[PDB]
Design a protein around this nucleic acid. Structure first.
Ligand SMILES: [Mg+2]
Ligand SMILES: [Mg+2]
Ligand SMILES: [Mg+2]
Ligand SMILES: [Mg+2]
Ligand SMILES: [Zn+2]
Lengths: 62, 135, 255, 20, 172, 84, 33, 96, 155, 261
RNA sequence: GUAUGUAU
RNA sequence: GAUCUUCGGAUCACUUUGGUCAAAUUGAAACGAUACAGAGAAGAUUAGCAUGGCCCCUGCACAAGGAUGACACUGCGACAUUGAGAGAAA
C-alpha cells in the first residue's frame, strides 16, 4: 500500500480530486462474459421502467 | 527521405533544415542519420520518431561533407571553414583540423587514422586523426 | 479509448452498449476526420451521437455530445462570454479551422491543463459582481377623453406585463426604451379603468388614457423626458426642450 | 503461443468483473 | 546564466542536448571536469536492442501507409470482438459521483460501397520548433581593401537588355 | 499589440538571424514604452546568438536609460563568459 | 447617409517579467479610433 | 480512382512532376543556377554583403551566350575567383 | 540550538532550529544534513501561497526515512505555531509517522497546528522561498524543472 | 385532443421556369436561367397557426424528454392529435442542450451567409431579424400583438425608416420557435433572419452585460453555500465582527478544519 | 468580342 | 405453443430499429442572366518550357492539356562621419 504523506493540498475542488484517465472518469478494459452483461442489462432496465411505470410488477417466477 | 528497400515506399520525411541537405552519413547505433546543409548546421536524427536529437551549429557555412570513422565512434564534418571533427550522442566538439584554405567537398577517413580532404582548387591535404597536424 | 461524453447523456442505466465507427463526420470545429460514437439513452429515445473530435473537446472541455461544460453545466458560448476564462475568439469559417488546430498544436506538445481552482474563482467573483451592480387633474382630463381601453405608462417589459396582466384581460402590451413609454391595451374598459386607479403613482408611474430622421427625433424625445423627470425631482436646452414639447402637443391637438 | 516479460498493472476499481 | 539557459531550451519537447554556454565551443580535451574520453563504438547488446526498436517502429508505420494507399476493395475485416470497458467518472458537475458503468463497444461494420466521407482541406503548415543557439567562432577582421576586392561590376548584355535602362556607347 | 507583436514573431520564424528584424521589433516596443516586454525579447536574442555585438551593446544602453546599474553588470558579466 | 479574428497568432514568448503592460494597451486603441 | 477524385478533390500542390522530355532542358538549368547560388555563397568570405549572389549569374549567362557566339568575354575588374567559377560552370554546359 | 544552510539551484536558505523545544526532530534533521543524505534531492511539492515540501531521496512522494530507523513520534508545543510565511515543519502520514520530509510555509496555516512537528524558522533566504514557490507545475503539483538541493551544511 | 391543421398534406411536383429546369437527381432541385428569381421571391404561406386554438395534448407530453414539432410552428402538422412531438410553446422548464435546436435539428459551426433556420452553437442569439410591411405607426401595435404570443419578449425594436425589427426574446427556445412561425407570413412575406451583432460599441456592451448576467445566474446555483452565505452576508452587513470571529475559528481546508474538530 | 476574369 | 410427466416439474426459444433532419422556400453543388473589359516576351505579329502556392478545372494518370490555364514589386538599409558657419535650449 505505502501511503503518500504530506499536508494535502487544501484548495483542491471537486473536479481535480478524482483520478481520470479520460477527462470525465477513469476508463479501463473489462472481461465479462457477454451473457452476464446482457443478463445484467435487462434487469436494470426493468427497474428503471418500473419507477416510470410506478409499478413493481411482482417478482419473476416459475 | 528514408526509403523502404523492398516496398519502395517512403517511411520518413526528416523535415527541419531550411535548405539543400548537401550531405549524409549513416550508422547502426543512435545518431543513425547525420545531415548537413546550406543552413551551415547539422542535426542528429531519430530514425524511429522522425525528429532531431541535437542541433549542432558550430559551422559558419555550407556543410559539403560528413563521414564516420571506421571504429572510433566519431564523425568529421567538413566545409570551406574549419574542417571540424566531433564525438557522438551529444556530439560535443573535439577539435579543428586547421590549414585548408579552399572549399572542401570530401572527408574520407582511413582505418590507420588518415583523413583526406580534396578541395575545389585541387588542394589535397592529408591529415592525422589523433593530433590535427596535417602531414 | 471510449469518448469524452459526460455522465448526463449516458443516462439512467449503468450498462451501456455503444458502437464506434472509425471515420464518420469530420469534426464541426476542428474540421478534420474523427470517430462517431453512437448509443441509446432510454427506452424509445432517439440515439445519441458525438459531434466533436476529442482533440477539440479536450481544449474546449465539454461532453462530446451535450457540449455543456463539465464543471458547471452551462453551454460553451454562454461560458466563454460571461466567465471569459480561456478567451477564445475565431468564430469564422476558415480562421476557426486553424485557431482550433493551433490549440490542438499547443495542448498536444505542452500539456496545458484546464485549471479548475482558478476557474471556480472566476465564478464566485462573477456572482458578487452581479449583486453590486443592482393626479386629480389627470383623471378629469382623462375622463373627458373617455366620454368622447389603452393606458399610457409614462415615467422592464416582463414587469410591465406582470403588473398589468394581474389587473385584467390584456389585448396587447408595448414598450420603447428610447421612447421610455409603454401602451397597455386591455380587452375590456372595466379592467383598464380599474388598472388606471390601481397603478397611479406606483413603482416597478404616470398612468393616463392613451391616444435616420425617426431615430434622431426619438433620441431627442429621450433627452426631453430625461430632463423632465430630473427637474420635477429638483437652462437654454431646458427652454428649447419646452418649445419642442409645446410644438408636439400643438401637432397632436391639430391632427 | 509466445512468451513475454513482466508488468503487473493495478486496477483502480475493486469488486467483481460483471457488476460495476 | 543559471536560470537563463532555460530560455533557449523552452519548447523543443527534447532539449537536454541543446547548447548554452561558451563551454560548448571548448574542445573535449579541455572541458575541465571530465573523467575520460570514450572512443570505442558501444556494444552488440545495444545494437540488437536498437535494431529491434527501429524495425518494429517502421513496420507499424509502413503497415498504416499501405492501409491508406490501397482502399482494400471488398476486403472488409470484422474486428468482431465486443470490447468491454469500465468507466470511472470524475465528479463532473457534482451529484452522483461514481457507480463505474460498464460500456460495451462494438464496431459498426462499414458498407463496402460508400466512397470517402470527406474532402481534402489544404491548410498552411504550422510554425517550426524554435531555433537553437548559434555558437559561431569569433568573426574575423575584414578591412576596407578586402571588401573592395570583392567588388562585382554589374554586367550588361550584348543582346538581352530588356525594359529600358539606356546605357551610353562608351560603356560597352 | 497583437497584430504588430505577432507579425514580427511570425517573421522571426522565417529567419531567426536577421539582425535588422530583431532591432526593428525591439524599437517598436519601447516607442510605446513597455520595457519589461522587451527585456525578455532582448535576452532571447543574446542567447540565440552570442557573437552579435550589436545586440550586446544595445542590451546595456537600454539599461542605462531604464535605470538600475546592477542589472547592467550581471548582463555585462555574462558577456565576459563568452570572453569577447 | 482578416480583421475578424487575426490571421495567425504567435504568442510573445514566456512569463519572465508583464500583466501591467497589457492593461494600458487595451484602452489606447479606443483613443486612437 | 475517379470516384475518390469526386468525393475528395486533388491533393496539395506538389506531388512530383517526373521530368519527361518537354521539361528537361529547363530543369537542367534550374539546378545549375542553384549550384552556382551554392558555390558563391561559400566562395564569399564571412562578411562582404550578399548583393552579389543573384548578381553573379547575369555574367554566367552572358558568358554562356558569349561562347555560343564565339566572342571572347573579357570583363573589367571582377574577382579572379569569380572569373573562374564562371569559366568552369560554363565549360560544363558547353559539353552537355 | 544550531542552524543549517541549504544550497539550491535558485538560492541559499539559512534556518534556525528550535532544538530546545524539539530535541529528536532537530537530532534527525541535523544528522542527515551532515551525512550527505539531503544532497541532490528535489522539492517534489510546490503550492502557490501554501508550502514547498521536500526531503524525498526516492523522488517519489512515498520515500525517506529517519536516523532512528523508519519513523518517530511527533512533539507538539503550544509555543510553536504556523503564524508566518517561512516556517520549517516535518511532514507526516498520520499521528506518529515522521520521515525525513519537511516543508516551508508561504502563508499562515492555523489548521496544521497540532498535527505536524514544527522545528525551525527561516532567517535568511525568504526571497528564495517566495521565488521558489511560484514555479510552473504539472496538475500533480510537481515542478517542471526539478528544484534540487545541492548541499546541506550544518552550522 | 390536438388539432390536425391539415389532414391531407402536400405533394410536390413542379416545372418552374417553364422551359426545362431539368432536375438534378443528385440534389433534388431544378437548374436553369434566372438564378435571381430563386435568391429572392419567396411565396406566402398557405396557413399560419393560432396558439390558443391549435395547441393541446400529444403523445410527446407523456414522454419526458421530447422536442416540439417543426410543422406545428409552420401551422400544418397533419398529425395534430397523435403527433410524436410537442404541440406547445417553449417554457423555462423545457430546457434542451447546446448542440440541439429546440426542434431537435442539430446546430452547426457558424451560421449561413443569408442566415438560415438554425444558428451556431459558438455564439448565442436570443434575437430575430425581420423585414416587414409598413402601413403607418400602428405597425408597433401589430408587431407587439403577434410576436408577444409566441414567447416571452425582452425588447421589441422597430426601425420605421427601414421596415426592420430586432426582436430579442426571454428564453432562447422561444427565439428559435418564434422565427419559424413568424417567417413566411403577412401583416410580401415577412423575412426572418438571425441577427448580426448590432452596430456601435455601447449597445454591444449592453448586450454583453445581459449575457454575463445570464451566466452569473446560471453559475449561482453551483457555488458553495458558505461562499453563497458570504456574499449574501456581506451585502446584509453593508458583519465585520462576524468575519473576525470566523477567521479566529479557522486559525479541503474547510474539510480539514472540520475533520480536526 | 471569344478564349479569360471583375461587379450585381 | 411442442416433447417427456404428479395438476407440482422440467426441457427447447432471449432485447429489433445504418438515422444529415419527422412534411422539398431559411443549413450540404453554380451556374446562369446582365453589364463592363477584352488576351506573355521593352516595333509589330508570333511556338513554347519552366518558376512559387491558402487559385483550380479536364484526366485512371508520377502522360498531357486548359491563353505559355490564371495570378505573381522592384522605397529600406546594423550609420559612421570630417571641417567650418548660424540658430534655440543647460
Ligand atoms: Mg500546360
Ligand atoms: Mg500564346
Ligand atoms: Mg494551346
Ligand atoms: Mg505555368
Ligand atoms: Zn475535432
Amino acid at each position: 500500500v505505502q501511503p503518500a504523506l504530506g499536508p494535502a493540498n487544501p484548495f483542491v475542488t471537486k473536479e481535480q480530486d478524482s483520478i481520470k484517465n479520460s477527462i470525465t472518469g477513469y476508463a479501463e478494459r473489462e472481461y465479462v462474459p457477454n451473457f452476464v452483461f446482457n443478463q445484467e442489462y435487462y434487469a436494470n432496465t426493468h427497474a428503471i421502467y418500473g419507477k416510470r411505470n410506478f409499478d413493481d410488477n411482482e417478482a419473476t417466477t416459475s | 527521405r528514408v526509403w523502404d528497400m523492398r516496398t519502395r515506399q517512403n517511411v520518413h520525411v526528416l523535415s527541419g533544415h531550411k535548405s539543400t541537405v548537401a550531405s549524409l552519413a549513416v550508422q547502426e547505433f543512435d545518431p543513425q542519420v547525420v545531415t548537413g546543409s546550406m543552413d551551415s548546421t547539422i542535426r542528429l536524427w531519430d530514425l524511429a520518431a522522425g525528429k532531431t536529437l541535437t542541433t549542432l551549429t558550430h559551422h559558419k557555412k555550407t556543410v559539403r561533407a560528413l563521414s564516420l570513422h571506421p571504429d572510433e565512434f566519431t564523425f568529421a564534418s567538413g566545409s570551406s571553414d574549419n574542417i571540424k571533427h566531433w564525438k557522438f550522442p551529444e556530439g560535443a566538439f573535439m577539435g579543428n583540423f586547421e590549414g585548408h584554405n579552399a572549399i572542401v567537398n570530401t572527408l574520407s577517413i582511413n582505418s590507420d587514422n588518415v583523413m583526406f580532404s580534396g578541395a575545389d582548387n585541387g588542394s589535397m591535404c592529408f591529415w592525422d586523426w589523433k593530433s590535427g597536424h596535417k602531414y | 479509448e471510449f469518448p469524452s461524453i459526460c455522465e448526463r447523456c449516458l443516462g439512467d442505466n449503468s450498462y451501456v452498449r455503444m458502437t464506434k465507427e472509425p471515420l464518420g463526420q469530420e469534426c464541426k470545429i476542428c474540421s478534420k476526420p474523427c470517430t462517431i460514437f453512437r448509443w441509446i439513452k432510454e427506452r424509445g429515445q432517439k440515439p445519441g451521437k458525438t459531434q466533436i473530435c476529442v482533440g477539440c473537446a479536450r481544449y474546449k472541455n465539454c461532453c462530446q455530445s451535450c457540449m455543456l461544460d463539465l464543471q458547471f453545466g452551462l453551454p460553451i458560448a454562454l461560458r466563454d462570454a460571461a466567465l471569459k476564462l480561456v478567451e477564445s475568439g475565431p468564430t469564422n469559417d476558415i480562421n476557426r479551422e486553424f485557431f482550433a488546430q493551433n490549440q490542438q498544436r499547443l495542448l498536444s506538445n505542452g500539456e496545458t491543463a484546464y485549471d479548475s481552482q482558478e476557474a471556480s474563482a472566476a465564478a464566485r467573483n462573477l456572482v458578487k459582481k452581479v449583486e453590486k451592480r443592482e393626479x386629480x387633474x389627470x383623471x378629469x382630463x382623462x375622463x373627458x377623453x373617455x366620454x368622447x381601453a389603452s393606458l399610457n405608462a409614462e415615467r422592464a417589459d416582463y414587469k410591465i406585463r406582470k403588473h398589468f396582466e394581474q389587473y385584467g384581460p390584456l389585448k396587447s402590451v408595448v414598450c420603447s426604451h428610447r421612447a421610455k413609454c409603454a401602451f397597455v391595451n386591455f380587452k375590456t374598459r372595466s379592467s383598464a379603468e380599474i388598472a388606471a386607479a390601481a397603478s397611479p403613482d406606483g413603482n416597478v408611474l404616470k398612468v393616463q388614457w392613451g391616444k435616420x430622421x425617426x431615430x434622431x427625433x426619438x433620441x431627442x424625445x429621450x433627452x426631453x423626458x430625461x430632463x423632465x423627470x430630473x427637474x420635477x425631482x429638483x437652462x437654454x436646452x431646458x427652454x428649447x426642450x419646452x418649445x419642442x414639447x409645446x410644438x408636439x402637443x400643438x401637432x397632436x391637438x391639430x391632427x | 503461443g509466445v512468451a513475454r516479460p513482466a508488468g503487473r498493472g493495478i486496477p483502480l476499481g475493486q469488486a467483481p468483473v460483471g457488476l460495476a | 546564466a543559471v536560470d537563463y539557459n532555460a530560455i533557449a531550451r523552452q519548447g523543443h519537447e527534447h532539449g537536454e542536448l541543446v547548447q548554452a554556454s561558451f563551454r560548448d565551443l571548448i574542445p573535449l580535451r579541455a572541458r575541465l571536469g571530465v573523467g575520460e574520453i570514450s572512443l570505442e563504438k558501444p556494444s552488440d547488446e545495444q545494437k540488437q536492442e536498437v535494431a529491434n526498436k527501429t524495425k518494429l517502429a517502421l513496420q507499424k508505420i509502413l503497415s498504416k501507409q499501405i492501409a491508406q494507399s490501397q482502399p482494400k476493395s471488398a476486403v472488409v475485416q470484422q474486428r468482431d470482438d465486443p470490447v468491454y470497458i469500465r468507466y470511472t467518472p470524475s465528479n463532473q458537475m457534482g451529484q452522483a459521483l461514481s457507480k463505474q458503468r460498464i460500456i460495451k463497444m462494438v464496431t459498426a461494420e462499414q458498407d463496402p460501397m460508400e466512397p470517402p466521407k470527406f474532402r481534402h482541406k489544404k491548410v498552411p503548415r504550422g510554425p517550426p520548433s524554435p531555433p537553437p543557439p548559434v555558437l559561431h567562432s569569433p568573426p574575423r577582421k575584414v578591412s576596407a581593401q578586402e571588401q573592395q576586392d570583392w567588388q562585382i561590376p554589374p554586367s550588361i548584355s550584348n543582346w538581352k537588355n530588356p525594359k529600358g535602362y539606356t546605357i551610353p556607347l562608351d560603356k560597352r | 499589440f497583437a497584430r504588430a507583436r505577432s507579425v514580427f514573431e511570425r517573421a522571426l520564424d522565417v529567419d531567426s538571424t536577421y539582425i535588422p528584424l530583431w532591432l526593428k521589433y525591439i524599437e517598436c516596443e519601447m516607442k510605446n514604452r513597455n520595457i519589461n516586454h522587451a527585456r525578455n525579447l532582448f535576452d532571447r536574442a543574446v542567447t540565440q546568438l552570442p557573437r552579435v555585438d550589436k545586440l550586446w551593446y544595445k542590451y546595456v544602453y537600454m539599461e542605462e536609460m531604464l535605470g538600475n546599474i546592477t542589472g547592467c553588470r550581471q548582463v555585462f558579466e555574462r558577456w565576459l563568459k563568452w570572453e569577447p | 447617409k482578416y480583421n475578424a479574428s487575426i490571421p495567425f497568432e504567435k504568442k510573445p514568448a514566456i512569463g519572465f517579467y508583464x500583466x501591467x503592460x497589457x492593461x494600458x494597451x487595451x484602452x489606447x486603441x479606443x483613443x486612437x479610433x | 480512382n475517379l470516384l475518390a477524385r469526386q468525393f475528395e478533390g486533388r491533393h496539395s500542390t506538389g506531388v512530383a512532376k517526373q521530368i519527361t522530355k518537354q521539361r528537361v532542358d529547363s530543369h537542367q538549368d534550374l539546378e545549375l543556377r542553384a549550384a552556382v547560388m551554392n558555390d558563391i555563397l561559400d566562395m564569399i568570405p564571412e562578411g562582404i554583403r550578399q548583393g552579389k549572389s543573384k548578381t553573379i549569374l547575369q555574367h554566367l549567362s552572358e558568358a554562356w551566350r558569349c561562347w555560343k557566339a564565339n566572342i571572347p568575354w573579357k570583363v573589367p575588374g571582377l574577382p579572379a575567383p569569380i572569373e573562374n567559377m564562371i569559366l568552369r560552370y560554363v565549360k560544363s554546359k558547353a559539353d552537355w | 540550538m544550531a542552524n543549517v544552510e541549504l544550497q539550491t539551484s535558485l538560492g541559499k536558505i539559512l534556518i534556525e532550529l528550535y532544538t530546545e523545544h524539539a530535541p529528536k526532530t532537530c537530532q534527525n534533521f541535523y544528522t542527515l544534513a551532515k551525512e550527505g543524505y539531503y544532497d541532490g534531492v528535489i522539492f517534489h511539492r510546490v503550492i502557490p501561497d501554501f508550502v514547498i515540501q521536500g526531503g524525498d531521496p526516492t523522488g517519489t512522494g512515498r520515500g525517506g526515512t529517519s536516523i532512528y530507523g523508519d519513523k518517530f513520534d511527533d512533539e507538539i508545543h503550544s509555543d510553536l505555531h504556523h503564524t508566518g510565511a517561512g516556517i520549517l515543519s516535518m511532514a507526516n502520514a498520520g499521528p506518529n509517522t515522521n520521515s525525513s520530509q519537511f516543508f516551508i510555509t508561504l502563508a499562515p496555516t492555523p489548521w496544521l497546528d497540532g498535527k505536524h512537528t514544527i522545528f525551525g524558522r527561516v532567517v535568511s533566504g525568504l526571497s528564495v522561498c517566495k521565488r521558489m514557490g511560484l514555479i510552473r507545475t504539472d496538475s500533480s503539483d510537481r515542478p517542471i524543472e526539478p528544484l534540487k538541493i545541492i548541499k546541506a551544511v550544518a552550522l | 385532443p390536438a388539432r390536425k391543421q391539415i389532414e391531407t398534406r402536400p405533394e410536390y411536383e413542379m416545372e418552374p421556369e417553364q422551359p426545362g429546369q431539368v432536375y438534378n437527381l443528385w440534389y433534388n432541385k431544378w437548374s436553369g436561367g434566372m438564378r435571381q428569381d430563386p435568391l429572392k421571391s419567396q411565396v406566402k404561406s398557405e396557413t399560419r397557426c393560432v396558439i390558443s386554438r391549435d395547441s393541446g395534448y400529444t403523445k410527446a407530453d407523456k414522454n419526458p424528454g421530447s422536442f416540439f414539432c417543426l410543422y406545428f410552428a409552420r401551422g400544418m402538422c397533419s398529425e395534430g392529435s397523435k403527433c410524436e412531438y410537442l404541440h406547445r410553446l417553449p417554457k423555462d422548464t423545457d430546457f434542451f442542450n447546446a448542440n440541439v435546436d429546440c426542434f431537435g435539428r442539430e446546430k452547426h459551426a457558424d451560421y449561413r451567409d443569408d442566415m438560415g433556420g438554425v444558428g451556431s452553437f459558438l455564439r448565442q442569439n436570443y434575437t430575430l431579424y425581420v423585414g416587414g410591411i409598413t402601413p403607418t405607426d400602428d405597425i408597433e401595435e401589430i408587431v407587439s400583438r403577434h410576436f408577444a404570443e409566441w414567447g416571452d419578449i425582452e425588447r421589441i425594436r422597430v426601425l420605421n425608416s427601414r421596415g426592420i425589427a430586432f426582436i430579442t426574446y426571454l428564453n432562447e427556445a422561444n427565439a428559435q420557435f418564434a422565427k419559424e412561425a413568424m417567417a413566411h407570413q403577412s401583416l410580401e412575406c415577412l423575412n426572418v433572419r438571425w441577427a448580426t451583432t448590432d452596430p456601435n460599441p455601447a449597445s454591444q456592451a449592453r448586450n454583453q452585460r445581459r449575457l454575463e448576467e445570464r451566466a452569473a445566474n446560471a453559475v449561482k446555483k453551483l457555488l458553495p453555500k458558505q461562499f453563497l452565505l458570504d456574499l449574501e452576508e456581506t451585502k446584509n452587513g453593508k458583519x465585520x465582527x462576524x468575519x473576525x470571529x470566523x477567521x479566529x475559528x479557522x486559525x479541503x481546508x474547510x474539510x480539514x478544519x472540520x475533520x480536526x474538530x
